[PDB]
Write a protein that binds this ligand. Structure first.
Ligand SMILES: [Cl-]
Ligand SMILES: [Cl-]
Lengths: 165, 223
């Protein structure tokens, strides 16, 4: 029954509008892509102190509704609705652990939920869309703050509609 | 509703609007004078339900009623497996007087027939990504269970059926959840889910298969 709302108190839309995930205690930093491992293109999601508010996301559920509830399984993606090149997934990558990364394919039903935490929301990843969720937090490696599973230590965000663009 | 048209006013007098802070978030279907059927994913702890509407402005709709409801019962197997068994019954606080613009509809007992053309109605998004000002209607045709399971396995379950996917790009879309799919004079389905974007050739939408639930609906309404 809990509807996810933006910083204006309005329900977050199902895919139609983009939003920034603004850390509640890191408004100076914002989501960006960075390199991980030996990869030559930046595919990992980090919280970058040089970009604020960072790359906006869309939250998508296949349900034919235009709001998002905390109980829904979601895809989260960067970029326009029309593109699936920015879709989040969680991928094992040493030495980060289970890192949030982008890829260019998308399941009908994504593996994330947005759940109330503290003064805002946390992103929770459910392997195999099962019952047990793993909190997404920050892992500091290589001078970067990677979004990655850090269960019990979630990064807490508020959700700001991206009407500045 | 994608590639539909304005409904003839009050031609779907079972249509219910579920509104939150004065904005529609799902539809439902009046199935008894005190009960609205909708998708379980539309559950809220309380509801404001608009009956007899065409536009969503009750102050411009003679014969309409805006009614409160506290109690709702989701199907006990909702979301196991994921997305399946997507129906709930909302008990209105008071029984409504039925009229020619507010009327219950009977539920199909027979399951959907592959190929049959049916009608879906709602206030959800149009092809242009805007919301309509009045209730929209469109025809979509039932697709076989073989095609529905090929496209949607591993999430196809027989509490669902598929309709649409024509060259005509007629479909339901976001904001149509919980609304009716009428086949051959009876309520056959509820708008449930689909692949985005709406209106893709060869991709039908998924509807709650209400023929599977007639006993649970009757028992819940009578209890
Ligand atoms: Cl703000
Ligand atoms: Cl490597």
């Amino acid at each position: 029954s809990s509807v996810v709302v933006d910083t204006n108190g309005q329900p977050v839309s199902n895919g139609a509008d983009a939003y920034y995930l603004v850390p509640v205690s890191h408004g100076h930093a914002g989501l960006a892509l960075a390199k991980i491992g030996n990869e030559a293109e930046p595919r990992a999601v980090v919280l970058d102190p040089h970009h604020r508010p960072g790359l906006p996301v869309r939250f998508e559920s296949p349900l034919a509704i235009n709001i998002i509830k905390e109980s829904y399984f979601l895809n989260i993606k960067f970029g326009p609705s029309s593109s699936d090149s920015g879709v989040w997934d969680v991928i094992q990558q040493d030495p980060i652990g289970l890192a949030v990364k982008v890829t260019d394919t998308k399941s009908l039903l994504g593996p994330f939920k947005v759940e109330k935490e503290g003064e805002g929301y946390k992103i929770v990843y459910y392997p195999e869309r099962g019952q047990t969720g793993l909190d997404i937090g920050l892992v500091h490696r290589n001078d970067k703050y990677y979004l990655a599973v850090k269960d019990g230590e979630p990064c807490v965000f508020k959700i700001r509609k991206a009407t500045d663009e | 509703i994608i590639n539909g048209e304005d409904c003839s006013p009050h031609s779907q007098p079972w249509q219910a609007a579920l509104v939150m802070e004065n904005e529609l978030f799902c539809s439902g279907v009046l199935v008894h004078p005190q009960w609205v059927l909708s998708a379980a994913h539309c559950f809220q702890n309380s509801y404001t339900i608009g009956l007899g509407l065409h536009s969503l402005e009750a102050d411009q709709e003679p014969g309409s009623q805006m009614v409160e409801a506290s109690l709702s019962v989701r199907h006990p197997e909702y979301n196991r497996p994921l997305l399946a068994n997507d129906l709930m019954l909302i008990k209105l606080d008071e029984s409504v007087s039925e009229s020619d613009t507010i009327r219950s509809i009977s539920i199909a007992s027979q399951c959907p027939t592959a190929g049959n053309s049916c009608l879906v109605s709602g206030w959800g998004l149009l092809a242009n990504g805007r919301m309509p000002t009045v209730l929209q209607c469109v025809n979509v045709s039932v697709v076989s269970e073989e095609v529905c399971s090929k496209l949607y396995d591993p999430l196809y379950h027989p509490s669902m059926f598929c309709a649409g996917g024509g060259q005509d790009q007629k479909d339901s879309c976001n904001g149509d959840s919980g609304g009716p799919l009428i086949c051959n004079g009876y309520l056959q389905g509820l708008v449930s889910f689909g692949k985005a974007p709406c209106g893709q050739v060869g991709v039908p939408g998924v509807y709650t298969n209400l023929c599977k639930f007639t006993e649970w609906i009757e028992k819940t309404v009578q209890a």
